[PDB]
Design an enzyme around this catalytic site. Structure first.
Site, PDB file in Angstrom:
ATOM      1  N   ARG B  63       1.099  -2.913   2.513  1.00  0.00           N
ATOM      2  CA  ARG B  63      -0.220  -2.374   2.824  1.00  0.00           C
ATOM      3  C   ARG B  63      -1.062  -3.373   3.604  1.00  0.00           C
ATOM      4  O   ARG B  63      -1.859  -2.978   4.461  1.00  0.00           O
ATOM      5  CB  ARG B  63      -0.943  -1.966   1.538  1.00  0.00           C
ATOM      6  CG  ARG B  63      -0.306  -0.804   0.797  1.00  0.00           C
ATOM      7  CD  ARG B  63      -1.354   0.003   0.041  1.00  0.00           C
ATOM      8  NE  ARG B  63      -1.122   0.002  -1.402  1.00  0.00           N
ATOM      9  CZ  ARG B  63      -1.779  -0.764  -2.267  1.00  0.00           C
ATOM     10  NH1 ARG B  63      -2.718  -1.599  -1.840  1.00  0.00           N
ATOM     11  NH2 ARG B  63      -1.499  -0.697  -3.561  1.00  0.00           N
ATOM     12  N   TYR B  67      -3.188  -2.766   6.945  1.00  0.00           N
ATOM     13  CA  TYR B  67      -4.614  -3.048   7.080  1.00  0.00           C
ATOM     14  C   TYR B  67      -4.878  -3.994   8.244  1.00  0.00           C
ATOM     15  O   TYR B  67      -5.862  -3.832   8.975  1.00  0.00           O
ATOM     16  CB  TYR B  67      -5.161  -3.637   5.778  1.00  0.00           C
ATOM     17  CG  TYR B  67      -4.952  -2.758   4.565  1.00  0.00           C
ATOM     18  CD1 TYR B  67      -4.918  -1.373   4.680  1.00  0.00           C
ATOM     19  CD2 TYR B  67      -4.786  -3.314   3.304  1.00  0.00           C
ATOM     20  CE1 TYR B  67      -4.729  -0.569   3.573  1.00  0.00           C
ATOM     21  CE2 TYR B  67      -4.596  -2.518   2.190  1.00  0.00           C
ATOM     22  CZ  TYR B  67      -4.567  -1.147   2.331  1.00  0.00           C
ATOM     23  OH  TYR B  67      -4.377  -0.351   1.225  1.00  0.00           O
ATOM     24  N   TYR B  89     -12.126   8.089   4.242  1.00  0.00           N
ATOM     25  CA  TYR B  89     -12.622   9.101   3.319  1.00  0.00           C
ATOM     26  C   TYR B  89     -13.441   8.459   2.206  1.00  0.00           C
ATOM     27  O   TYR B  89     -13.261   7.287   1.864  1.00  0.00           O
ATOM     28  CB  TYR B  89     -11.462   9.916   2.738  1.00  0.00           C
ATOM     29  CG  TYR B  89     -10.677   9.238   1.632  1.00  0.00           C
ATOM     30  CD1 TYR B  89     -11.030   9.405   0.297  1.00  0.00           C
ATOM     31  CD2 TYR B  89      -9.567   8.457   1.921  1.00  0.00           C
ATOM     32  CE1 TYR B  89     -10.311   8.799  -0.715  1.00  0.00           C
ATOM     33  CE2 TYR B  89      -8.839   7.847   0.914  1.00  0.00           C
ATOM     34  CZ  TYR B  89      -9.217   8.021  -0.402  1.00  0.00           C
ATOM     35  OH  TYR B  89      -8.498   7.417  -1.406  1.00  0.00           O
TER      36      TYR B  89
END
Ligand SMILES: Nc1ncnc2c1ncn2[C@@H]1O[C@H](CSCC[C@H](N)C(=O)O)[C@@H](O)[C@H]1O
Ligand SMILES: Nc1ncnc2c1ncn2[C@@H]1O[C@H](CSCC[C@H](N)C(=O)O)[C@@H](O)[C@H]1O
EC number: 2.1.1.-
Lengths: 371, 370
Positions: B63, B67, B89
């Site tokens: 991850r 990023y 979101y």
């Protein structure tokens, strides 16, 4: 018969209101609003013909709890008469707001439809303006007076947010503002827990679109300067950054396999980016050897095989927008899924079937396929 | 170059703020990461130049590399002079790594950088569970960080844990997370709260017709394999207070809270009670102090110092435009007078306040004319 929906308006005028808050304003039978921005109040009056300002039920020397009782009863009275009432409070309507929780709970106890819609709070604005993540390294939020009265514990390794630092120990109201004469008691506690040299950020989000936020960096000891403590009022919030960083437990991090197994994590260094309001923590630079390696791996990047891009229609996009923006259409759809389904124009056969099922998986498959 | 980062809320479309949408439409480039298809289908109709950041996740891919790549995709457009708007979101800065990294680097190199707040899952948690963070305080942790750094609990205040469905996982899989270390989290919660204490498994509705998941478990029940199964990537835990902290009466008189002749209640909290908390001595809704406040409503008139709103439609529309039209706001901030003297049908006091721009002048202009 009769219901109570409570919505918010955000902090900054008009712009921070959610689309669904606006939609439930318009469809309301009667609107009771408590906002502290003139344009936001004017914006509410043009979207519903039946509005009552709740601010008029404050009064000089009048207890705030008595005003909160009256504000909840003004709404519940229209509820018990069978009306569809919408309550409006600026920011997030359930964040440091007494009458909204009281009104919704009493209406629930008497069997009415009651629901609160979330909004953008002052803490949300604080996260954005100060560019801090509550995740790093944890966030603790208190009411300033409750923080003193019940001697609530601090967490000097995590964020600390204090609301209502401008009315310490004040149960009254005054239209001119609060006489924050007990502010020195709050300063005494902050100094006792953090020391006089630690940072405290006086935060006031901009309420009008052209204004700038107040993000003034003080020390706790500087709050005793008269000219400083006069600056904090009724819309003031304190942010206190962590005084230190807690160490990683290498035993637990091996149990969770956060890092590659075989390596020992860095004990005095946080990962980029740093908190610009925090005392300096040794923080890794943005572009180390691991970072540019992933950036240069972008040269060979292709969409993964299991990546499923959106593939929907204009009719399907329009009907889901309507379910989110039209409370009238949403109420019909939940009442009878198929009768609403075969009424939407231009829906593909699968789209009608997926919408008739209503399941999350069917709607997502219908919007990821398309022949 | 510049970077504006906005959010969409949790529930699709409806929980987007009015200003997030306007900065979407006015943007030169849009990079978005949402997990709802209709919301994604809402974005691309509002700007013709969007890139889905979700494609830079991959199976087995870290991850943190994503990023870094997510931030770099926006940053390398910012260094090229365009006006980029990133979308995530919920609240774009609440438990979101690439948004903060991109904004910090954008700041460090001298570009304009601003984040607009959004409605988070914590905000939705407050509403759906109908709790107030003030009563009695709120502590929010990342679930794994809460374990790794042995963060202290506060059994007298709210506790909210994000990412309880990803305990300790740094990798990605499109199938989602194998929450195989979830039992490490349950061990900690039982040690701090006991096996019989309440934990609420919360999943806000993502679609307008869904209802939220507000399942009331005990911490011990989390060990049941069919309980651990239903917490995933969009799950959040709420832990109500185990007890209420006592009022320090010496502090009460230092603050002069109540009349110096009346003594408040020492072991009773105000109505309403927390419907998810073990029963606490709670006041009834309609006590005599409340009924006294109800009957005094019959004799209510607007207080003399109350100043009702008194504005025009020309003034209402120009402030709506300043909040809903980012290009007009950029014009006004560049030259107040040129903008103020150009808006039609503004009362001379209204234009004068607009040209000043001060909050005191705008509020006077909107409350003054009888
Ligand atoms: N513009 C602003 N900037 C920072 N904090 C604010 C603010 N407006 C209100 N607050 C905080 O909120 C308190 C009032 S209680 C109302 C809070 C509101 N419901 C919300 O969502 O935030 C104030 O004492 C102050 O601490
Ligand atoms: N629909 C939902 N209901 C409850 N929690 C949710 C949620 N969607 C995301 N979350 C929380 O957010 C975490 C992802 S990090 C994304 C958070 C988002 N920026 C926000 O504003 O909330 C998840 O692990 C989960 O804990």
């Amino acid at each position: 018969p009769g219901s109570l929906i409570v919505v918010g308006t955000g902090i900054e005028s008009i712009g921070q209101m959610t689309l669904q808050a606006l939609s439930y304003i318009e469809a309301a039978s009667k609107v009771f609003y408590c906002v502290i921005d003139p344009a936001t109040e004017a914006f509410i009056l043009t979207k519903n013909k039946n509005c009552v300002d709740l601010y008029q039920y404050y009064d000089n020397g009048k207890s705030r709890m008595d005003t909160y009782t009256q504000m909840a009863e003004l709404m519940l009275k229209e509820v018990r008469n069978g009306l569809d009432v919408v309550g409006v409070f600026y920011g997030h309507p359930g964040v440091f707001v007494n009458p909204s929780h009281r009104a919704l709970a009493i209406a629930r106890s008497e069997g009415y439809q009651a629901r609160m819609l979330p909004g953008v709070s002052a803490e949300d604005c604080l996260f954005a303006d100060l560019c801090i993540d509550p995740s790093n390294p944890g966030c603790l939020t208190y009411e300033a007076s409750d923080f003193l009265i019940r001697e609530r514990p601090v967490n000097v390794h995590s964020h600390l947010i204090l609301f209502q630092v401008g009315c310490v120990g004040i149960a009254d109201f005054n239209f001119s503002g609060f006489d924050n004469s007990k502010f020195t008691i709050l300063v005494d506690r902050l100094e006792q827990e953090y020391g006089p040299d630690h940072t405290v950020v006086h935060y006031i989000a901009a309420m009008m679109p052209h204004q700038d936020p107040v993000t003034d960096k003080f020390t706790i000891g500087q709050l005793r300067e008269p000219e400083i403590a006069k600056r904090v009022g009724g819309v003031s919030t304190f942010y206190i950054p962590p005084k230190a960083r807690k160490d990683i437990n290498t035993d637990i991090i091996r149990l969770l396999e956060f890092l590659p197994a075989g390596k020992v994590p860095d004990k005095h260094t946080q990962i980029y980016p740093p908190n610009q309001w925090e005392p300096d923590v040794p923080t890794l630079p943005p572009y180390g050897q691991n970072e540019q390696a992933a950036i240069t791996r972008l040269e060979a990047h292709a969409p993964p095989e299991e990546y499923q891009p959106l593939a929907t229609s204009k009719a399907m996009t329009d009907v889901m927008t309507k379910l989110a923006l039209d409370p009238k259409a949403l109420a019909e759809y939940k009442a009878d899924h198929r009768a609403f389904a075969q009424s939407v124009p231009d829906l593909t056969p699968q789209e009608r079937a997926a919408l008739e099922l209503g399941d999350s998986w069917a709607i997502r498959c219908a919007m990821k396929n398309m022949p």
